[PDB]
PDB file of C-alpha atoms in Angstrom:
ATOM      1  CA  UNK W1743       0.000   0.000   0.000  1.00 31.57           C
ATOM      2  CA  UNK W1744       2.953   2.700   1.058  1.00 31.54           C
ATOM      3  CA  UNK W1745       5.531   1.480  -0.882  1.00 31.89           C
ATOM      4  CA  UNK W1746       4.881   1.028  -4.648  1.00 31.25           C
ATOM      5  CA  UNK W1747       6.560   0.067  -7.448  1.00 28.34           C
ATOM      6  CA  UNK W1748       8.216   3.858  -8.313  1.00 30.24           C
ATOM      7  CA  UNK W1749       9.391   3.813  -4.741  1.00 32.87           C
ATOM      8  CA  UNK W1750      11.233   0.609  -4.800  1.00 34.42           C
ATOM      9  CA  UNK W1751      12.838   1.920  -8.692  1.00 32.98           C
ATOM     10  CA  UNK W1752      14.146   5.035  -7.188  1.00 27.80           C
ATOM     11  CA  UNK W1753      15.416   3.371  -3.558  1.00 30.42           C
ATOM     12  CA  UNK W1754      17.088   0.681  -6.162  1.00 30.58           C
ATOM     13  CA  UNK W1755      18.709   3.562  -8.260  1.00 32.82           C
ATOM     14  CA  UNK W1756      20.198   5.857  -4.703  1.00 31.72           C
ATOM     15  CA  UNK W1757      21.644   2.638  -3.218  1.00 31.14           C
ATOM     16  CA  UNK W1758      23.166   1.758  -6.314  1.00 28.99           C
ATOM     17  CA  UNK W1759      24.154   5.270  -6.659  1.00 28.92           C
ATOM     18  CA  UNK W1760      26.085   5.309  -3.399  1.00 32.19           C
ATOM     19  CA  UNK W1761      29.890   5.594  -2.600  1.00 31.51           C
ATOM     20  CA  UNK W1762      30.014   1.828  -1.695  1.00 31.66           C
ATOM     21  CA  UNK W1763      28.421   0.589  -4.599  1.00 31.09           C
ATOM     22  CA  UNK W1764      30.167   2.960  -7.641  1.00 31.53           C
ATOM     23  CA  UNK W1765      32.600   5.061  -6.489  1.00 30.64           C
ATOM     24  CA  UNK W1766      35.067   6.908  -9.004  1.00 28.43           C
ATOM     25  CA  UNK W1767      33.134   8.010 -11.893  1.00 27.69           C
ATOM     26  CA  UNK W1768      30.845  10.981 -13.145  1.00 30.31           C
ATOM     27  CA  UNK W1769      27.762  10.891 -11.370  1.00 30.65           C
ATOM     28  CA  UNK W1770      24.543  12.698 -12.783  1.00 31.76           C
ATOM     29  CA  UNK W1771      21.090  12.936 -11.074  1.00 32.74           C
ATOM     30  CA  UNK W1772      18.341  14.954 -13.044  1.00 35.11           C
ATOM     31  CA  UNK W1773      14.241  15.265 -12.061  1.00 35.56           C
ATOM     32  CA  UNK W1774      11.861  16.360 -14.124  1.00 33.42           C
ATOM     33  CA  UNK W1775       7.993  16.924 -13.152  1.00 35.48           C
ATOM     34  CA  UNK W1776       5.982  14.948 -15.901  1.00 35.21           C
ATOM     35  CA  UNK W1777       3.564  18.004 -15.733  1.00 40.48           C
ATOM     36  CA  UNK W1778       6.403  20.401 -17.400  1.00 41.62           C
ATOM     37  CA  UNK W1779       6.600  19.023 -20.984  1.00 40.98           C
ATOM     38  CA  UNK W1780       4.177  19.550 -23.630  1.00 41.75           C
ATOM     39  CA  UNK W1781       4.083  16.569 -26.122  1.00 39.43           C
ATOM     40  CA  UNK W1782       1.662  18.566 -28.539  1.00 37.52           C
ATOM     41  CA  UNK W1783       4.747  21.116 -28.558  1.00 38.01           C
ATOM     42  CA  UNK W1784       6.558  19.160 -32.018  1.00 36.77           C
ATOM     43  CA  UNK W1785       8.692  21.772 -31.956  1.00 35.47           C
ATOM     44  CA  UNK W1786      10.660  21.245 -28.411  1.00 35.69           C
ATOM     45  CA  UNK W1787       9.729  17.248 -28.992  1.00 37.32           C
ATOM     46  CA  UNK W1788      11.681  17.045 -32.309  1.00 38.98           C
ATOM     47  CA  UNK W1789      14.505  19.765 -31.685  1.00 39.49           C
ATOM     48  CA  UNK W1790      15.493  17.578 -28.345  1.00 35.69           C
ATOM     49  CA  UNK W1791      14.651  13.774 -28.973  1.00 32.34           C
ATOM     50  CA  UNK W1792      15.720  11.516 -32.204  1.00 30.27           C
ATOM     51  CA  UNK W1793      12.369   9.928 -33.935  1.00 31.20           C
ATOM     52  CA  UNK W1794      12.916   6.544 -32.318  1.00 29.39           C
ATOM     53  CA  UNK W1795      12.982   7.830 -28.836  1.00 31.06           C
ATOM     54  CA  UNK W1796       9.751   9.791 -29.872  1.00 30.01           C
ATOM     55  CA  UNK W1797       8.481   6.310 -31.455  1.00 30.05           C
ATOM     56  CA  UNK W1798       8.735   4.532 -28.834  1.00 32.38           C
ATOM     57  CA  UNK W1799       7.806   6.950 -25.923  1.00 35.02           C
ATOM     58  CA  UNK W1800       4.830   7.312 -28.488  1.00 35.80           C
ATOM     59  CA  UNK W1801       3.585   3.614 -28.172  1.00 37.16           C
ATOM     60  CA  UNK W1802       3.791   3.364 -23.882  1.00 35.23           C
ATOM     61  CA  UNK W1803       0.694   4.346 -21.753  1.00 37.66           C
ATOM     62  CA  UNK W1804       1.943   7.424 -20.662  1.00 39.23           C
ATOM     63  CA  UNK W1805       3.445   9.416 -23.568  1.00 39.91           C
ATOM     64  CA  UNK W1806       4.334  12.520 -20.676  1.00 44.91           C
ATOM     65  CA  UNK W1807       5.280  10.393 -18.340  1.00 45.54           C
ATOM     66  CA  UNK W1808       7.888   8.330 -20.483  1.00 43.61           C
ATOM     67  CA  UNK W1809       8.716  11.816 -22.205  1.00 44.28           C
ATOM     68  CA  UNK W1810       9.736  12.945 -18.690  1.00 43.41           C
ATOM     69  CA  UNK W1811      12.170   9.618 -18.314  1.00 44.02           C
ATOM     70  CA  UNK W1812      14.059   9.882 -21.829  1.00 45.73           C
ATOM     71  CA  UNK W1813      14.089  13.968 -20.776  1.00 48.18           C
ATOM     72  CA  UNK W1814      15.782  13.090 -17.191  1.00 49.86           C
ATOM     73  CA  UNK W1815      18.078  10.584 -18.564  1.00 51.66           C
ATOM     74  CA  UNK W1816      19.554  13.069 -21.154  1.00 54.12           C
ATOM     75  CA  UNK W1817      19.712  15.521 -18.235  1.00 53.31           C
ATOM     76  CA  UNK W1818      21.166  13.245 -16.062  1.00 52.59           C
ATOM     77  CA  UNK W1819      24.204  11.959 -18.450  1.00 49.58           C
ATOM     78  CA  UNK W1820      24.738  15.645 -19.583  1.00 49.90           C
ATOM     79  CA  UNK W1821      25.482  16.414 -15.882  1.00 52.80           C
ATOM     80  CA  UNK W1822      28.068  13.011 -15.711  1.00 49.74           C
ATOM     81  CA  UNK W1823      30.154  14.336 -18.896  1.00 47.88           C
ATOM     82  CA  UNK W1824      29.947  17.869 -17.048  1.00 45.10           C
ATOM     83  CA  UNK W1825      30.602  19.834 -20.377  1.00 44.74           C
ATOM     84  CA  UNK W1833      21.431  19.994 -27.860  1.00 45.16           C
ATOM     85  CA  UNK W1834      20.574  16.808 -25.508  1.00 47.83           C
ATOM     86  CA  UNK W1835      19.293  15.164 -28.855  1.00 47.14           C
ATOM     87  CA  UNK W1836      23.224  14.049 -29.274  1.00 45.65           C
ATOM     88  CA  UNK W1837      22.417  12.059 -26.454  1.00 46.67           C
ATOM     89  CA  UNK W1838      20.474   9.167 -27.356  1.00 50.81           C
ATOM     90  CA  UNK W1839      18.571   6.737 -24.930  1.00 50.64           C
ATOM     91  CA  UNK W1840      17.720   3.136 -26.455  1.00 54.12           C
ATOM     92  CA  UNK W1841      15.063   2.244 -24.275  1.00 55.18           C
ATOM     93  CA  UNK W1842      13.615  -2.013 -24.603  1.00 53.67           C
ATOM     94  CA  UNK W1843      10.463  -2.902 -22.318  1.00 53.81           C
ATOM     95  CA  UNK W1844      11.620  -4.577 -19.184  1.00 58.35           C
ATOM     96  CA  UNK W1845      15.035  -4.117 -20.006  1.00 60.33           C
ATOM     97  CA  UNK W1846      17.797  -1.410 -18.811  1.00 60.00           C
ATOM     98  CA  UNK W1847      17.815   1.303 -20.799  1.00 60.33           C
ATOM     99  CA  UNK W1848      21.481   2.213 -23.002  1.00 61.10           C
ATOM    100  CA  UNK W1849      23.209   5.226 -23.628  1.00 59.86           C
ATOM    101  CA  UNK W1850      25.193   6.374 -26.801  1.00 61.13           C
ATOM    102  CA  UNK W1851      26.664   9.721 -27.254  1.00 60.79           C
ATOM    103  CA  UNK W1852      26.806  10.841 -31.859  1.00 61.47           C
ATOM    104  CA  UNK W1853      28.444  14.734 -32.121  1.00 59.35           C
ATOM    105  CA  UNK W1854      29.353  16.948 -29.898  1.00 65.32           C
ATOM    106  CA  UNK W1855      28.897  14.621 -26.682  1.00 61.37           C
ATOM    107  CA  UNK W1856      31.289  11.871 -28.482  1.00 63.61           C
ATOM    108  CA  UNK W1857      33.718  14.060 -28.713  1.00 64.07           C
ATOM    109  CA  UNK W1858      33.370  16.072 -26.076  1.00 68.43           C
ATOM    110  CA  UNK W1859      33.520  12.483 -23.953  1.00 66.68           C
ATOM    111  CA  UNK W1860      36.834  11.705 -25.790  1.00 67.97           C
ATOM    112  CA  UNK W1861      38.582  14.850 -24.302  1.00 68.70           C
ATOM    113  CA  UNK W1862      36.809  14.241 -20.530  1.00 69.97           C
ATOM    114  CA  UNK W1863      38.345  10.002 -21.363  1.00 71.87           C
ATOM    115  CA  UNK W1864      34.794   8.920 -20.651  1.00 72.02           C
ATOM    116  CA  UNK W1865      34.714   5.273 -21.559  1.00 73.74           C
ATOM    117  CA  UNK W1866      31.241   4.006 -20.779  1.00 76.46           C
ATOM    118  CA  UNK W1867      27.710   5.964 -19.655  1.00 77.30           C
ATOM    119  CA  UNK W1868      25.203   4.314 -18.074  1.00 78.81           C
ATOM    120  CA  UNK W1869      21.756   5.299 -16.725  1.00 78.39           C
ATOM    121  CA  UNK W1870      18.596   4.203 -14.372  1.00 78.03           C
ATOM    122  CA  UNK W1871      15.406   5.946 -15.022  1.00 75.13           C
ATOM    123  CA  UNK W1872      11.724   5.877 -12.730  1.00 75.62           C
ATOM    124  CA  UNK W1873       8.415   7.410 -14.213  1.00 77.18           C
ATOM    125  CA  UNK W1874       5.368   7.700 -12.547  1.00 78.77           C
ATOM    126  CA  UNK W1875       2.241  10.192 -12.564  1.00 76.44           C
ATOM    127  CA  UNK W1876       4.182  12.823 -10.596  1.00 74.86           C
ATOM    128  CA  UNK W1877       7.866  12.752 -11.224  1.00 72.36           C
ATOM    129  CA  UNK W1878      10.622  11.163 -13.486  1.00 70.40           C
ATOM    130  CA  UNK W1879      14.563  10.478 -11.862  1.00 67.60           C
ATOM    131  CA  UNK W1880      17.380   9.618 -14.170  1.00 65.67           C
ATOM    132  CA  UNK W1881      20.891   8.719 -12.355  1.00 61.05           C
ATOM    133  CA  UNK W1882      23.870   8.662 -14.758  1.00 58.91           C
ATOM    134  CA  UNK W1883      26.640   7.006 -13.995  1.00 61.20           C
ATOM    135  CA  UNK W1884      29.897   7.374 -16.133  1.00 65.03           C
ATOM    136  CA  UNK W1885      33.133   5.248 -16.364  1.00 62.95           C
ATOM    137  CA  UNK W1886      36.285   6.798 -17.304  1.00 61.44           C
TER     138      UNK W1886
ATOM    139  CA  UNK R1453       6.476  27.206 -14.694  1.00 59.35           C
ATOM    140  CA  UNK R1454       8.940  28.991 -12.807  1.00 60.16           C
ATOM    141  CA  UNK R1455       7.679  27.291  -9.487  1.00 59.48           C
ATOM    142  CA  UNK R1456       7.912  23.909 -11.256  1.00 55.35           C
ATOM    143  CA  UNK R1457      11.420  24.126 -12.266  1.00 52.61           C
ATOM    144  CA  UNK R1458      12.585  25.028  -8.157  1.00 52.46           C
ATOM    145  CA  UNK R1459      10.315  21.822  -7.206  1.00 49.67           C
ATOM    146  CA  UNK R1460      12.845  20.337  -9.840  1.00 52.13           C
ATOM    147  CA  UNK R1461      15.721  21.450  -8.266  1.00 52.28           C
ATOM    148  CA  UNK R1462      14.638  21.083  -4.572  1.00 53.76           C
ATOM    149  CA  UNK R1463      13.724  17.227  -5.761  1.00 54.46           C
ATOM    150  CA  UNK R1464      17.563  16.826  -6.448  1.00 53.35           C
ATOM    151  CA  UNK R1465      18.764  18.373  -3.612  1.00 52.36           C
ATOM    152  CA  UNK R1466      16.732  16.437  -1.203  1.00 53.36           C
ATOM    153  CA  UNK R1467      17.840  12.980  -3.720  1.00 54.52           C
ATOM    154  CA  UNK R1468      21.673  13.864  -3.622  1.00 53.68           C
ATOM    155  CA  UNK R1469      21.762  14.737   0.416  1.00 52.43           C
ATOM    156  CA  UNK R1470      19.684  11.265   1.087  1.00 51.42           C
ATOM    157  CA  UNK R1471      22.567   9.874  -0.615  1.00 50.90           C
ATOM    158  CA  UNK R1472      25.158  11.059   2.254  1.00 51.42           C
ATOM    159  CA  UNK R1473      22.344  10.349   4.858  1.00 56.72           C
ATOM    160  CA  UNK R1474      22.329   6.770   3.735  1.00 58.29           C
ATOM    161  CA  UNK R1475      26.199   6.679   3.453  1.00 60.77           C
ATOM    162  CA  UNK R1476      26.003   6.180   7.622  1.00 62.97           C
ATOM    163  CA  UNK R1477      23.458   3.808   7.910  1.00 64.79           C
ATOM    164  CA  UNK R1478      25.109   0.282   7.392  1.00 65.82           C
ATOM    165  CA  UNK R1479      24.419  -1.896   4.266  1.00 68.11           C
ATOM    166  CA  UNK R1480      22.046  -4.130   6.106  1.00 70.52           C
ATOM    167  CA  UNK R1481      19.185  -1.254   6.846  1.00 70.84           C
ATOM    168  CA  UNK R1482      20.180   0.956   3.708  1.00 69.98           C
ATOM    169  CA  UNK R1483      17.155  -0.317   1.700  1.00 66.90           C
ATOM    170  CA  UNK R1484      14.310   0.500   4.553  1.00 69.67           C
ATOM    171  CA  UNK R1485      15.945   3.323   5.286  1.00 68.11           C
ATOM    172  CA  UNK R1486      16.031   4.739   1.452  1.00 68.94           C
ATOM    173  CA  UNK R1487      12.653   3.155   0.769  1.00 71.47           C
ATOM    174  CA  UNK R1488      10.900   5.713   3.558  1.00 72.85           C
ATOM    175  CA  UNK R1489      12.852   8.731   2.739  1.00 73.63           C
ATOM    176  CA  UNK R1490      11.997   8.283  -1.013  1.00 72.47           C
ATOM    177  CA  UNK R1491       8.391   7.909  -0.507  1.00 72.31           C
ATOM    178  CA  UNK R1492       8.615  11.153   1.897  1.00 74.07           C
ATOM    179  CA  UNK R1493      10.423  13.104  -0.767  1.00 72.16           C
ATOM    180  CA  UNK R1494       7.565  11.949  -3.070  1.00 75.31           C
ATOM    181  CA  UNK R1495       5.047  13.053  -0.836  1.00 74.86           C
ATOM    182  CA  UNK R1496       6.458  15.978  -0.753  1.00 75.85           C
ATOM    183  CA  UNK R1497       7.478  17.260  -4.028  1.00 77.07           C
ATOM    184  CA  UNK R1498       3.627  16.180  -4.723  1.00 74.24           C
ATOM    185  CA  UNK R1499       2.582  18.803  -1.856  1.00 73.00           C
ATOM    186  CA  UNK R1500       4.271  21.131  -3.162  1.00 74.71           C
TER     187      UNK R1500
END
């Protein structure tokens, strides 16, 4: 009843986010209130997100609410690199952890920071959507 | 709009210092622990 599902996401994505757990890498947290992003607005939609992130966030229950995620996660790794968040690209498969993969200027501006790897954990609900990007040098 | 976007940023503040809040807590009780502080910070980004 108290705890639900989006509760036990974001709990999962702080204590993995901890010292103990990673330690030693670019770490990026990003919020975004579902309630802030207009998906009728093509013109923010398309100058921000590729077309398969809008295809697939498109196709889920809650086009605003998964909006909000891909949004956060962007966010979120922009803030790990510490340096146009439709360079950054989130692959995101049903029931499966979503991948990050950095085109232009991120790529290279990744290649001077000696950023290896970025990855990311992302909760959506009605209310709010949490990205934490972590990145591996 | 503008009151949105300081929810948004007082979201992340209260996320990044229950990070350091759960550092002292041993490993054992760290789930509980972050499980009622989430739901709290929830709560209250919803209030607000």
């Amino acid at each position: 009843s108290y705890i639900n599902a989006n509760t036990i996401e974001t709990a999962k994505m702080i204590e993995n986010m901890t010292k103990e757990k990673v330690s030693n890498g670019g770490v990026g947290v990003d919020v975004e209130l579902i309630t802030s992003i207009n998906v009728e607005n093509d013109t923010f939609i398309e100058r921000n997100f590729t077309p398969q992130e809008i295809e697939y966030c498109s196709a889920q229950p809650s086009v605003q609410s998964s909006f909000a995620g891909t949004w956060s996660a962007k966010e979120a790794v922009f803030k790990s690199l510490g340096v146009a968040l439709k360079d950054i690209e989130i692959v995101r498969v049903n029931k499966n952890a979503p991948a990050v993969e950095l085109h232009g200027n991120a790529k290279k501006a990744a290649e001077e920071a000696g950023v290896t790897d970025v990855k990311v954990s992302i909760s959506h609900d009605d209310l709010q959507a949490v990205a934490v990007a972590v990145s591996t040098k | 709009v503008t009151r949105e976007a300081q929810i948004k940023d007082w979201v992340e503040n209260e996320l990044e210092a229950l990070k350091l809040e759960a550092e002292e807590i041993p490993s054992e009780d760290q789930n509980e622990f972050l499980l009622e502080r989430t739901r709290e910070i929830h709560n209250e980004a919803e209030s607000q």
